[PDB]
Amino acid sequence: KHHHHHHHHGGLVPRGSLHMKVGILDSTLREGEQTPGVVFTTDQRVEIAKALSDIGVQMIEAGHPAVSPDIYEGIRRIIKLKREGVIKSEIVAHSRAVKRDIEVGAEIEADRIAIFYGISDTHLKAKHHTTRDEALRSIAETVSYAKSHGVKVRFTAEDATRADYQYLLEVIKTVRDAGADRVSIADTVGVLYPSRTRELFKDLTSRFPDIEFDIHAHNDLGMAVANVLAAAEGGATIIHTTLNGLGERVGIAPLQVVAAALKYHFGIEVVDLKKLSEVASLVEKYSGIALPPNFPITGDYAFVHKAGVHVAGVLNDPKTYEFLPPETFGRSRDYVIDKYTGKHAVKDRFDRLGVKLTDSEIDQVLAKIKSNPNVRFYRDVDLLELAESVTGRLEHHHH
Amino acid sequence: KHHHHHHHHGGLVPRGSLHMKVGILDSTLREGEQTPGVVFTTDQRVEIAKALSDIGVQMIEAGHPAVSPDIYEGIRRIIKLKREGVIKSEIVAHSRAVKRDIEVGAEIEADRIAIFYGISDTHLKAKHHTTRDEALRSIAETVSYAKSHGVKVRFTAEDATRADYQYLLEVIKTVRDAGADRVSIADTVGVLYPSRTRELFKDLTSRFPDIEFDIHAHNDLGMAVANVLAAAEGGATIIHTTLNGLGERVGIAPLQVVAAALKYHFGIEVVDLKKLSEVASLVEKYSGIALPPNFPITGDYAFVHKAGVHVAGVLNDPKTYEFLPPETFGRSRDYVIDKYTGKHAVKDRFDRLGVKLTDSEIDQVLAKIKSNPNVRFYRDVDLLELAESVTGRLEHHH
Ligand SMILES: CC(C)(COP(=O)(O)OP(=O)(O)OC[C@H]1O[C@@H](n2cnc3c(N)ncnc32)[C@H](O)[C@@H]1OP(=O)(O)O)[C@@H](O)C(=O)NCCC(=O)NCCS
Ligand SMILES: CC(C)(COP(=O)(O)OP(=O)(O)OC[C@H]1O[C@@H](n2cnc3c(N)ncnc32)[C@H](O)[C@@H]1OP(=O)(O)O)[C@@H](O)C(=O)NCCC(=O)NCCS
Ligand SMILES: O=C(O)CCC(=O)C(=O)O
Ligand SMILES: O=C(O)CCC(=O)C(=O)O
Ligand SMILES: [Zn+2]
Ligand SMILES: [Zn+2]
């Protein structure tokens, strides 16, 4: 059900509402550990990998084993758990285009080796100190070398979204010929525009039908989610994510939001939607970066209503202010009470507390609530005290 | 292999040059006989149906049996040939939403009955004198009745492209529930804009995955070909054509152009491309309507070059001025000579004629050619006379 292969889809569902394929690669353990201030222990890494396997992630990028001894050891443990059937996702190891990295990737027995290289002109010049042609040779050699160990090879075209497009096409032919079966198109600095992303992937998939494409999208301009969905429309079959929007700088497409947007817009369930909160909370614990309360899907406030008009509507039909039911994600709605509330919301909360107030008493409590501008919420004890102030009586709920 | 089922495709081929499907329904025998001044005899109908089958058309719309006794007889003969396996295409009979048309369509044993009804506001009011709700009931009953005879049913939404879209969706739900497996979307007056056609079919195919859609596109604004390719982009699996642009008023999408355009842009071959000229000619003969010389693909001049600069280029590499090789369609290139010519062209024609002239003599001939403003063609006899007039030698087998 929450399996570890591709999910069939048909693109966007109809307005006012299966030949294509898509799945998740989660990079919490690679991209995600490149977040300033974030490091994971080996045990933490392993615990996260198991959680990602359990919710049905297709691929886990477990790290770049040359980076440090602990990353090597965490990847090894994960591959061992995979070999034992405890973990079921495909395990990907990252690699520079250097023989050493590749040999290490091969020796730990990863399912896939992802070789990256920067193929924009700034990267070729400033980062690699190389020419277009020399880069083509290095990439061909390293991809072939990795292939010859009998492991599947992805090539990541770093800064592809600012690269010369003709060169990008040449890069892809090169790595295809050298044995790569997947190419990741990396929007390294988050500058893709969604409608253009769709076009890009439509073009690439039409040109290279023997290759499957990944989208790796950074959120520098706040459009990572929209870019990954657009890529999927265009035929990308793997979307890279991290839990909680972890990664370099502002991070990449966040798993919980991507998964929800794919459910709503494409009608598919690429991971266990009901377990997003639990996995997000786990990563939050080990990463030490708190999710803001406004984070989509898993955020504290995602299904919390405030304005009186909204709460009144929700009490009649939650769909009025809820894009999908909270239960879709294993959550429940709530509402808060402050000076923005109204009579229906206040009545409903008193009803929950078992306190019967008259219509005019409700008016008086509402007026008292609205008389103070700088109170952030009214807790039940506050509301009980307000009622007492109106009834003169000592005022049953189990929470 | 020019078989008689759907052809697989993947939409447009990449810039700088399989989950979808498409095939041809040719309506030369139905829509095409609705061209002013065109009628076919029963014999000619049968012979056109055979040629349509031979080139690999998926569906032949062989006529509307209720219209006349000779149409009824032609269809009956076509169906007999289908039974005998001479004709292999699916045979479609047209029908109004009237019990008699349907019984008759059932009675001749057509493979499919196509019931049409006008679902735009002007059609409902001025032509059917009915309401949206009544139309729905009539359409439901008639489709159901046709389906109860155990025959496949297409519903044609006439004037769909100017109908209320919400109503069109209700129409399609209605006929689908009544048992229609195909719906034809008719751009009856040719007002579809191509990019909007793609969107229309994309939307309809996503909403009704258990129906296949046809496009029937008229050429009133010259965009029938662009419209049918756009419909195919969007998921239409049947494109309606006629040979030679036959049909009411200005006709519908012409088979030879649709077939070429699909080959170039989608990379597929939905009929035998090398037989297009032959079938166009046959239909030209029986319709009595000549194709203009500029008609694409099969026209006299489709692969005939004129300007000196073009002919010089083509003589070095024909691809310079040919979208695809003429042999694609079993044809050959040519060029003409008039005041627009140049030295490479004139030299080449003399070579064909076996006449050896010096460059100086070519220049003189060329100057004489360019001195006659109103000579339409220098035919070979004329060229031989020009060469004789320059060389003083005998030069002049056609
Ligand atoms: C990999 C790592 C151990 C290398 O450390 P290092 O050898 O001290 O090198 P530096 O970090 O100073 O990085 C630059 C070197 O890598 C090279 N390089 C960068 N990307 C490369 C690639 N895709 N293929 C080959 N070489 C690459 C640079 O040209 C440079 O080489 P140089 O030492 O000859 O100048 C270290 O950078 C690291 O731990 N990085 C974290 C992982 C990471 O950077 N991931 C990048 C994802 S794009
Ligand atoms: C079909 C046929 C013989 C009808 O002849 P007719 O009975 O003398 O009627 P007319 O052609 O004058 O008028 C059409 C009649 O059919 C009705 N009609 C039109 N389209 C219809 C449809 N899709 N379903 C049912 N009835 C329809 C009209 O309301 C009108 O009815 P009326 O007689 O009550 O006014 C005759 O119109 C004919 O041969 N037409 C050629 C085929 C044709 O018209 N094809 C159109 C494809 S869109
Ligand atoms: O391997 C990938 O797809 C992404 C590499 C990366 O982090 C980037 O270039 O942004
Ligand atoms: O049957 C069809 O598909 C087309 C009907 C027709 O004649 C039209 O509306 O143009
Ligand atoms: Zn990245
Ligand atoms: Zn028509």
How would DSSP label each residue in B180-244?
Answer: -SEEEEEETTS---HHHHHHHHHHHHHH-TTSEEEEEEB-TTS-HHHHHHHHHHTT--EEEEBGG
Q: Which of B14, B19, B203 sits opposite A203 (nearest CB)?
A: B14
Report CB contact under 8 Å: B203, A13: no
Q: At what angle do helices B380-391 and B359-370 cross, to 10 degrees?
A: 120
The protein residue whose alpha carbon is closest to atom 32 in ligand 1 is A128
A vs B: CB pairs below 8 A: 13
Q: CA-to-CA distance for A140 and A136, rounded, in angstroms? A: 6
The alpha carbon of residue A14 is apart from the nearest alpha carbon of chain B, in Å, by 6
Q: Which of A14, A206, A207 sits opposite B207 (nearest CB)?
A: A14
Catalytic residues of B: 310
Element at A78 (helix H, strand E): helix A69-83
Burial letters for B196-235: b for 16+ Cβ neighbours within 10 Å, e otherwise? ebbebbbbbbbbbeebbbbbbbbbbeebbbbbbbbbbbbb
Report CB contact under 8 Å: B19, A19: yes
Q: Which two tokens stand for residue B371?
A: 């001195």
Q: Answer yes or no: is B94 a known binding residue.
A: yes
Element at A112 (helix H, strand E): strand A112-118
Element at A23 (helix H, strand E): strand A20-26
The alpha carbon of residue B16 is apart from the nearest alpha carbon of chain A, in Å, by 10
Q: CA-to-CA distance for A12 and B326, rounded, in angstroms? A: 42
Q: CB within 5 A of ion ligand 6: which residues?
A: B 31
Ligand nearest to the CA of B128: 2
User: Tokens 């049905």 correspond to what residue?
Assistant: A56
User: From 3.30.565.10, 3.20.20.70, 1.20.1270.360, 3.90.550.10, which CATH number describes the B7-287 domain?
Assistant: 3.20.20.70
Report CB contact under 8 Å: A203, B15: yes
Residue B125 CA to ligand 2 centre (angstroms): 15
Residues 205-224 (A) with a CB less than 8 A from some CB of B: 206-207
Q: Which two tokens stand for residue B318?
A: 């024909």
Q: Answer yes or no: is A45 a known binding residue.
A: no
Q: Which two tokens stand for residue A23?
A: 């799945």
B97 lines ligand 2 (CB under 6 A): yes
The protein residue whose alpha carbon is closest to atom 43 in ligand 2 is B67
Task: Resolution in Å, one decimal, please.
Answer: 2.0
Burial letters for A148-176: b for 16+ Cβ neighbours within 10 Å, e otherwise? eeebbbbbbbbbbbebeeebbebbbebbb
Q: CA-to-CA distance for A210 and B36, rounded, in angstroms? A: 52
Q: CA-to-CA distance for B327 and A46, rounded, in angstroms? A: 65
Q: Which of A10, A14, A206 sits opposite B203 (nearest CB)?
A: A14
| Interface contact A292, partner B, CB < 8 A | no
Residue A53 CA to ligand 1 centre (angstroms): 30
| Interface contact A14, partner B, CB < 8 A | yes
Sign of the Cα torsion A358, A363, A364, A370 reads positive
A188 lines ligand 3 (CB under 6 A): yes
| Interface contact A15, partner B, CB < 8 A | yes
Element at A113 (helix H, strand E): strand A112-118
The closest alpha carbon to A275, from A26, A64, A51, belongs to A51
Q: Which two tokens stand for residue B208?
A: 């009704």
Q: Answer yes or no: is B162 a known binding residue.
A: no
Q: CA-to-CA distance for A62 and B214, rounded, in angstroms? A: 50
| Interface contact B16, partner A, CB < 8 A | no
- Per DSSP, the three-state class of A64 is coil
On whether the CB atoms of residues A45 and A29 are closer than 8 A, the answer is yes
The closest alpha carbon to A250, from A228, A220, A221, belongs to A220
A67 lines ligand 1 (CB under 6 A): yes
Contacts of A207 in chain B (CB under 8 A): 14
The alpha carbon of residue A265 is apart from the nearest alpha carbon of chain B, in Å, by 13
Residue A93's DSSP bridge partners are A63, A113
Best residue in B173, B206, B208, B211 for a mutation probing chain A (most A CBs within 10 Å): B206
Contacts of A58 (CB under 8 A, 6+ apart): A4, A5, A6, A23, A24, A25, A89, A90, A238, A270
Element at A143 (helix H, strand E): helix A132-147
* Cα dihedral: B96, B98, B103, B106 (round 10): 30
Task: Give the Å distances, CA to CA, from A187 to A175, A192, A214, A219, B343.
Answer: 19, 7, 11, 9, 56
Q: Considering just the CA atoms, what is the radius of gyration of chain B in Å?
A: 25
Q: Determined by which method? A: X-ray
Q: Answer yes or no: is A15 a known binding residue.
A: no
* Nearest atom, ligand 2, residue B128 CA: 29
Q: CA-to-CA distance for A20 and A201, rounded, in angstroms? A: 13
Q: Answer yes or no: is B188 a known binding residue.
A: yes
| Interface contact A203, partner B, CB < 8 A | yes
- Could you give the angle at the alpha carbon of B339 between the alpha carbons of B337 and B340, nearest 5°? 75
On whether the CB atoms of residues A386 and A370 are closer than 8 A, the answer is no
Backbone φ and ψ for B91, nearest 5 degrees, come out as -105, 120
